[PDB]
Amino acid sequence: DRVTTQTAGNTAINTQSSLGVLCAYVEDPTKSDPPSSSTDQPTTTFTAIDRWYTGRLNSWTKAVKTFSFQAVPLPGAFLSRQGGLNGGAFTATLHRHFLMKCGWQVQVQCNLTQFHQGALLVAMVPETTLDVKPDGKAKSLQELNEEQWVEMSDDYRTGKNMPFQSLGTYYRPPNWTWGPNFINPYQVTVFPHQILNARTSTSVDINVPYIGETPTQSSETQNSWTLLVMVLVPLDYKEGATTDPEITFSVRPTSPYFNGLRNRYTAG
Amino acid sequence: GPIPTAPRENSLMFLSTLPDDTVPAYGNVRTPPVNYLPGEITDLLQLARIPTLMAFERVPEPVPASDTYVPYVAVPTQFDDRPLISFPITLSDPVYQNTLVGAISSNFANYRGCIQITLTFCGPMMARGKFLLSYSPPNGTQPQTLSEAMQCTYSIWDIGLNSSWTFVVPYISPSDYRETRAITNSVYSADGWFSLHKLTKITLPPDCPQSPCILFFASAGEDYTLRLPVDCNPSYVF
Amino acid sequence: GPIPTAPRENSLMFLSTLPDDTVPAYGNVRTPPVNYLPGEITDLLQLARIPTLMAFERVPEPVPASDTYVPYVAVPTQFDDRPLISFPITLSDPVYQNTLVGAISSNFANYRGCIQITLTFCGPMMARGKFLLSYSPPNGTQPQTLSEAMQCTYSIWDIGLNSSWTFVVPYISPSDYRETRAITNSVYSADGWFSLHKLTKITLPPDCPQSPCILFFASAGEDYTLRLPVDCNPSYVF
Amino acid sequence: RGNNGNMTFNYYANTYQNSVDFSTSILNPLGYLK
Amino acid sequence: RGNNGNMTFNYYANTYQNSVDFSTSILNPLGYLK
Amino acid sequence: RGNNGNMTFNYYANTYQNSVDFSTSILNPLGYLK
Amino acid sequence: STDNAETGVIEAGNTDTDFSGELAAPGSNHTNVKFLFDRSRLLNVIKVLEKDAVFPRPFPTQEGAQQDDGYFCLLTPRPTVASRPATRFGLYANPSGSGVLANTSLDFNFYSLACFTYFRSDLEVTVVSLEPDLEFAVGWFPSGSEYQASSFVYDQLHVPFHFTGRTPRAFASKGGKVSFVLPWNSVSSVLPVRWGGASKLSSATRGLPAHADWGTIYAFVPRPNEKKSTAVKHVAVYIRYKNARAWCPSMLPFRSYK
Amino acid sequence: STDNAETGVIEAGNTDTDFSGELAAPGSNHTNVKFLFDRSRLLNVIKVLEKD
Amino acid sequence: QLHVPFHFTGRTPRAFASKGGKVSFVLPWNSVSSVLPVRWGGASKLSSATRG
């Protein structure tokens, strides 16, 4: 058992010691319909893009602390090209369609030995902004390698690290305390998730269909499923064990929905 | 004894939209008949799908006559690679000042659906040209030259024995209803610009005049539905 | 003539919980559809039986980093005969600060039923130990050593190929409903402490690290029902 | 139609509610091109 | 359901009471492991 | 019984009027001498 | 028992999972989300208009501006600053100085239950004056629209336009209270309590869903403009949610330690 | 398309008049003229009589 | 600038009277125990409590 050879398009990934699947909210998530708000003929799926793209994430050592997480947005990951991960043909498509709509398979990657311990937590939270400190500039591919992890401060816990706006100098400068977007780390296992540790598994999967505030959000602005990995108990290993294991990931779109041709996107 | 009652918090108020009627102070009257005169209105949308002439800013030759604003297009002879007319879709822009769907949209809040614009040629029959018209959803900048308006959504058009070409801007949208005016010019209220380009030169024999003209119309399509009124703009009376 | 009526003492008041509805001031509108997005909530109890990581006070080594509070257990190597973790059952204690049933209980007044806690091991596969977990209803003092936690209600637990052990605190009670927080820490609101002891030593080969770790969860069982809400604690916003 | 909630009853008879006419004895478009 | 005592009648028709939708033409768990 | 005049109807349903119980699944004297 | 929680999905366990004993009866159902929320709740207070109103500006505003602040109430549970949709929530603790204090608001106790990501309802507007012996008038316009502000003279008396219009008004009694239920009117599909996104395509503050809201209530007295008193006055506004739904659950606000 | 508007009467054209795509559902009916006007509206103010 | 307390709002019901009116409503059971005692033995907690 426990050997899951998943084949799509022309690629095929298997993880020999895996666990299973985990759908969300509907037992078969790939089913959908073309959106009702549009009127144009939607460009549906095609077999050249039904794919596992993979991409390297930062490694992890002794020096990490509890609740420290990486988080990658989606499909905004495909735009800025983190970790040697690009959509390739897929970005060349969704630059040219003002409406985009799709659900996601993910299986994440590690492999610790049998003389280790330490629990990760792979989960994809819905509808968050865990990539910006309030200056207004979204962080990009250069400033990922200076930290390797987000040390989980209190300002994400109290919702103080969401981008506010220019108050206008007619008023008083305020005293902010709360925002509705936050992360409560004692609570984060209410989302589709599974404990990945050196106990039983090596690589493990999530699966999720669509959620949205509208039938179809915009092309290059929305980010529904950020996926975040966070450590609950740190690693311990004696001198001679394999130092600093490596993390990558594998993202699959399922049943894409495009709408609306124009020129290739050039940012204003 | 009387039936026991309990008045709730809503006492003696009157709501403007309150769906009920009031006791008449004088009743049992008759009226003149109606049926002889034709032309009823059940919905104003039977009204709304009539052609209406748009209104544009005049090219840089301001004639000092009153209100130098022009319901046509003066095509130039000269070769340049910028469009003839480019205007957005926000139904309060100064190009949508007196179109019907603009006019009866100007007092409503939200609509849904398509927007037809058509264009009627007017020139000498011995003249002939090729004109394409193109539409793009909101990009970062505005699509300017012919490759950009080429890739998106267009139709080329001949000059022949007829004189028009019915065009319908498709209805792509995040949310099904859309606003009518933009208090903040967001993605929910604009839908990208519209333009038309000259593809090949206007071609015409000698001793017949230069620079032909084209009129623009604007009408509601089939799916164009309105909802939920708002108080009006009295600025016409001042 | 009108029907005779008699207004009772309740005139023009509005009750907050008053089970009735009011006349709309604007009606007959439509809405965008719903059905496309999945994941409804009928009851929050479908919400309430999800695992949730507890939160404990750190052992006496205060790391000066922010909020030195720990969602696991650091088992020591040394032989002593006091339990590893002991915590009461009052659903406002600082061990129940961010568990789900604690969280959505913190704004309700009364519940009824069981409370599952389970615990997930995390250590090297070549390590193995025997751990018992025990529960006692309110005695005079607190049961401390292994005879006291032995007599009451317990389960021993292996380390093998799996990694957890689902445990359910039984529901013994004077009265069927119970409170959620104790204004006076009485018999109706507490139900005795919970603890777990190490029964035999953790056993592990050379060149693999000491002191393994165990995570704790806390979830509602089957019979866990809530009732009768109360106004909330706004102290999160300050 | 209009806007009412009067799906049960009205109080007065309709000849006291609004005037009715004399005795002289899926929608439609607005004028064809024949 | 909610909380009502309106087991006899409501005054307005329900299309005036609350909005209804368009035409696109014993409880359940929250996501299995297949 | 008690004291009521409500021989026609009550307004709310009785589950909103007063609490009812759970499911555990000519008068009489007060204790005989056997 | 002896199942492991690392598969992400574990069920519940009654007493006979491993012990001797039988499962207990279900107590109540004060749990269903379309009953739990249906509670009359005030969000804030309102300074009453008495003249030709003017409404606040876009995001930056230099001094010398003339707007009348704290007269509108963009009624949402979402955090709001100066009666326009903000993204964070202020509490002006050290208010000494110059420069006007903005009108903040938030629905406090809604989040402490809220384990959701998307929400759906209708609401009702309940108003109550705090000052005695007062008679007033409430107005409203829908979301994705904007207030009309001018005045037209009648018999030398300047009277503003918000006495009349299309959108409904309501005139109270002698110290009465006005209430009515109000349905959906939003351009988007469901109300978000979390959002990614931005208002326009580029160069926008990332996070505020500007057109997924309800609307606003303003109060004003039925008097002409030139007969206005010098004492200002106040009025509160209340909301009770109705027929609610919910989707795709999430976390809770973090409790103190502290 | 390719009809001419100079006949005075032109109909409307959906998306499949010349493009690929299908027509959209009707949204609402806040359009009928015996519902649109039914709104309480003041026209003016009045000085009050007190004599002959 | 006006300090307003929290007991204007909340979950549990409020009631605002009229001009010198009177407020009344019926209220059901809510007690953790079974029936109301007019006599009692017992104590609040297990030990060191006032008996009665």
Coordinates of N, CA and C in Angstrom, one line a residue, chain G residues 83-157:
Chain G
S83 N -16.1 57.1 8.5 CA -17.3 56.7 7.8 C -16.9 56.4 6.3
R84 N -15.8 55.8 6.1 CA -15.4 55.2 4.8 C -14.6 54.0 5.1
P85 N -14.6 53.0 4.3 CA -14.1 51.7 4.6 C -12.5 51.7 4.8
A86 N -12.1 51.4 6.0 CA -10.7 51.2 6.3 C -10.4 49.8 6.3
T87 N -9.1 49.4 6.8 CA -8.7 48.1 6.9 C -8.3 47.7 8.3
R88 N -7.9 48.6 9.1 CA -7.5 48.3 10.5 C -8.5 49.0 11.5
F89 N -8.2 49.0 12.8 CA -9.2 49.5 13.8 C -8.4 50.3 14.8
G90 N -8.8 51.6 14.9 CA -8.1 52.5 15.9 C -8.8 52.6 17.2
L91 N -8.1 53.0 18.2 CA -8.6 53.4 19.6 C -7.7 54.5 20.1
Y92 N -8.3 55.7 20.0 CA -7.4 56.9 20.2 C -7.3 57.1 21.7
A93 N -6.2 56.6 22.2 CA -6.0 56.5 23.7 C -5.4 57.8 24.3
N94 N -4.6 58.6 23.5 CA -4.0 59.8 24.0 C -4.4 61.0 23.2
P95 N -5.7 61.4 23.3 CA -6.3 62.3 22.3 C -5.9 63.7 22.4
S96 N -5.0 64.1 23.2 CA -4.7 65.5 23.4 C -3.9 66.1 22.1
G97 N -4.2 67.3 21.8 CA -3.5 67.9 20.6 C -4.5 68.7 19.7
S98 N -4.1 68.8 18.4 CA -4.9 69.5 17.4 C -5.1 68.5 16.3
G99 N -5.9 68.8 15.3 CA -6.3 67.8 14.3 C -7.4 66.9 14.8
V100 N -8.4 66.8 14.0 CA -9.7 66.3 14.4 C -9.5 64.7 14.6
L101 N -10.2 64.2 15.5 CA -10.2 62.8 15.8 C -11.2 62.1 14.9
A102 N -10.8 61.0 14.2 CA -11.6 60.4 13.3 C -12.7 59.5 13.9
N103 N -13.8 59.3 13.2 CA -14.9 58.5 13.7 C -14.5 57.0 13.4
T104 N -14.1 56.3 14.5 CA -13.9 54.9 14.3 C -15.1 54.0 14.6
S105 N -15.1 52.8 14.2 CA -16.2 51.8 14.5 C -15.7 50.4 14.2
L106 N -16.3 49.4 14.8 CA -16.2 48.0 14.6 C -17.3 47.3 15.4
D107 N -17.7 46.2 14.9 CA -18.7 45.3 15.5 C -17.9 44.4 16.5
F108 N -17.9 44.7 17.8 CA -17.0 44.1 18.7 C -17.2 42.6 18.9
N109 N -18.4 42.3 19.2 CA -18.7 40.9 19.7 C -19.0 39.9 18.6
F110 N -19.0 40.4 17.3 CA -19.3 39.5 16.2 C -18.1 38.6 15.9
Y111 N -16.9 39.1 16.1 CA -15.7 38.4 15.7 C -15.4 37.3 16.7
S112 N -15.8 37.5 18.0 CA -15.5 36.5 19.0 C -16.2 35.2 18.9
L113 N -17.2 35.1 18.1 CA -17.8 33.9 17.7 C -17.4 33.5 16.3
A114 N -17.0 34.5 15.4 CA -16.8 34.3 14.0 C -15.7 33.3 13.6
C115 N -16.1 32.1 13.3 CA -15.1 31.2 12.7 C -15.6 30.9 11.3
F116 N -15.3 31.9 10.4 CA -15.9 31.8 9.1 C -14.9 32.4 8.1
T117 N -15.2 32.3 6.8 CA -14.5 33.2 5.9 C -15.5 33.9 5.0
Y118 N -16.7 33.4 4.7 CA -17.6 34.2 4.0 C -19.0 34.1 4.6
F119 N -19.7 35.2 4.5 CA -20.9 35.5 5.2 C -22.0 36.1 4.3
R120 N -23.2 36.0 4.7 CA -24.4 36.2 3.9 C -25.6 36.5 4.8
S121 N -26.3 37.6 4.6 CA -27.4 37.9 5.4 C -28.3 39.0 4.9
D122 N -29.3 39.4 5.6 CA -30.0 40.7 5.5 C -30.0 41.3 6.9
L123 N -30.3 42.6 7.0 CA -30.1 43.3 8.3 C -31.3 44.2 8.6
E124 N -31.3 44.9 9.7 CA -32.3 45.8 10.0 C -31.7 47.0 10.7
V125 N -32.3 48.2 10.5 CA -31.8 49.4 11.0 C -32.7 49.9 12.2
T126 N -32.2 49.9 13.4 CA -32.9 50.4 14.5 C -32.2 51.6 15.1
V127 N -33.0 52.7 15.2 CA -32.4 54.0 15.6 C -33.0 54.4 17.0
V128 N -32.2 55.1 17.8 CA -32.7 55.6 19.1 C -31.9 56.8 19.5
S129 N -32.6 57.9 19.8 CA -32.0 59.1 20.3 C -31.7 59.0 21.8
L130 N -30.6 59.6 22.2 CA -30.1 59.5 23.5 C -30.5 60.8 24.3
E131 N -30.5 61.9 23.7 CA -31.0 63.2 24.2 C -32.5 63.1 24.4
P132 N -33.1 63.7 25.4 CA -34.5 63.7 25.5 C -35.3 64.5 24.5
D133 N -36.6 64.4 24.6 CA -37.6 65.2 23.9 C -37.3 65.6 22.4
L134 N -36.8 64.6 21.7 CA -36.3 64.9 20.3 C -37.1 64.2 19.3
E135 N -37.2 64.9 18.1 CA -37.8 64.3 16.9 C -36.9 64.5 15.7
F136 N -36.7 63.4 14.9 CA -35.7 63.4 13.9 C -36.2 62.7 12.7
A137 N -35.2 62.4 11.8 CA -35.5 61.8 10.5 C -34.2 61.1 10.0
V138 N -34.4 59.9 9.5 CA -33.3 59.0 9.1 C -33.4 58.9 7.6
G139 N -32.2 58.9 7.0 CA -32.1 58.7 5.5 C -31.1 57.6 5.2
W140 N -31.1 57.3 3.9 CA -30.3 56.1 3.5 C -30.1 56.2 2.0
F141 N -29.0 55.7 1.5 CA -28.8 55.4 0.1 C -28.0 54.1 0.0
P142 N -28.2 53.3 -1.1 CA -27.6 52.0 -1.2 C -26.1 52.0 -1.4
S143 N -25.5 50.9 -1.3 CA -24.0 50.7 -1.6 C -23.7 50.9 -3.0
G144 N -22.5 51.4 -3.3 CA -22.1 51.6 -4.7 C -22.8 52.9 -5.3
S145 N -23.3 53.7 -4.4 CA -23.9 55.0 -4.7 C -23.4 56.0 -3.7
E146 N -23.9 57.2 -3.9 CA -23.4 58.3 -3.1 C -24.4 59.4 -2.8
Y147 N -24.3 60.0 -1.7 CA -25.3 61.0 -1.1 C -25.3 62.3 -2.0
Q148 N -26.6 62.8 -2.2 CA -26.8 64.0 -2.9 C -26.9 65.2 -1.9
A149 N -26.1 66.2 -2.2 CA -25.9 67.3 -1.2 C -26.0 68.7 -2.0
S150 N -27.2 69.3 -1.8 CA -27.4 70.7 -2.2 C -28.6 71.2 -1.5
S151 N -29.0 72.5 -1.8 CA -30.1 73.2 -1.2 C -30.8 74.0 -2.3
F152 N -32.1 74.1 -2.2 CA -32.9 74.9 -3.0 C -33.9 75.7 -2.2
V153 N -34.0 77.0 -2.5 CA -34.7 77.9 -1.6 C -36.2 77.8 -1.8
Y154 N -37.0 77.9 -0.8 CA -38.4 78.0 -0.8 C -38.8 79.1 0.2
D155 N -39.4 80.1 -0.4 CA -40.0 81.3 0.4 C -39.0 81.9 1.3
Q156 N -37.8 82.2 0.8 CA -36.6 82.7 1.5 C -35.9 81.7 2.4
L157 N -36.5 80.5 2.6 CA -35.9 79.5 3.5 C -35.1 78.5 2.7

